[PDB]
Amino acid sequence: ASLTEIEHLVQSVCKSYRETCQLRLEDLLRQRSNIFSREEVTGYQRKSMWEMWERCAHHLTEAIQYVVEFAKRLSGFMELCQNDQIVLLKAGAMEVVLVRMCRAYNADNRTVFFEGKYGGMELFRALGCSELISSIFDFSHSLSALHFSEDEIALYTALVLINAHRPGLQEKRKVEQLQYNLELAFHHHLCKTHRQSILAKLPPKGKLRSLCSQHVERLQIFQ
Ligand SMILES: CN(C)c1nc2ccc([C@](O)(c3ccncc3)c3cncn3C)cc2c(Cl)c1-c1ccccc1
């Protein structure tokens, strides 16, 4: 409830993000001028569907591990029972990784950083999931227009994970209290930075979960 407590939560959220964000934003930004040549692009397109899914499933799985570390460094999260930790991470972790991808997305030319250089959608053609790739590019383009800071990303992804509506929770009221305090931390932070305007602009509920197709499920077969 307290203002000092709310400030402590904000620093808690931002600290854990800063240590689990995986790639440094200043490196991502420095590399925007480094674009795959047409020859390097064609090299990705000549991958087999399986080879290209093995590569992307490696990335997705790596990124989930970091989101799991992110959650476990939040003080309120380890207080929850382990069942509820599982239910939240299972239902929310892939959605956080998708949000985290907006940092690798350069809205200026509609390219994404991938394995060392920026490339267009055509780079993922060998997945055979054009619709999906397109939908992900359009979602990142939406988030990039908000000019999220690292702190704002940290707080937003916290609210993706800490959702009292996930079915299967056995201490619903605990996660509700946590969700409410995180909403207060988010709103408080945005007021102190005069950035409350973004709340109206956030992607609507459901559209982010709409991203997660079965294309990105059952990835164990890829090793
Ligand atoms: C837009 N889509 C097609 C994607 N973009 C991605 C952009 C970046 C990454 C990174 O993994 C990453 C992850 C987290 N934070 C920073 C970088 C990455 C790139 N270079 C080194 N890394 C670690 C992975 C992406 C993936 Cl897997 C997909 C994707 C691939 C297949 C299906 C769906 C999405």
Domain boundary assignment for the chain? 1-223
Beta bridge partners of 105: 112
Contact between 135 and 199 under an 8 Å Cβ cutoff? The reply is: no
Count the helices and strands in the chain (H runs, E runs).
11, 3
Return the ∠ at Cα 111 (arms to 106 and 115), rounded to 5°. Answer: 100
Contacts of 170 (CB under 8 A, 6+ apart): 81, 83, 84
Q: Can you point out the beta strands (E) in 22-175?
A: 105-106, 111-114, 117-119
Any idea which residue has 């197709």 for tokens?
213
Residue 98: alpha-carbon gap to chain centroid? 4
Among 104, 132, 109, 103, residue whose Cα is nearest residue 211? 132
Please tell me the class of the 1-223 domain: mainly alpha
Q: Rounded to a whole number, what is the largest CA-CA distance in the chain?
A: 57
Spatial distance between the Cα atoms of 89 and 82, rounded to a whole number of angstroms: 10
Q: Can you point out the beta strands (E) in the chain?
A: 105-106, 111-114, 117-119
| Alpha carbon nearest to ligand 1 atom 21, residue | 115
Resolution in A: 2.1
Å from CA of 68 to ligand 1 middle = 17
Pocket perturbation via mutation, ligand 1, pick of 101, 113, 136 by most ligand atoms within 8 A of CB: 101
Structure tokens given for 51: 């080879």
Spatial distance between the Cα atoms of 32 and 142, rounded to a whole number of angstroms: 18
- What count of other Cβ atoms lies within 10 Å of the Cβ of residue 89? 20
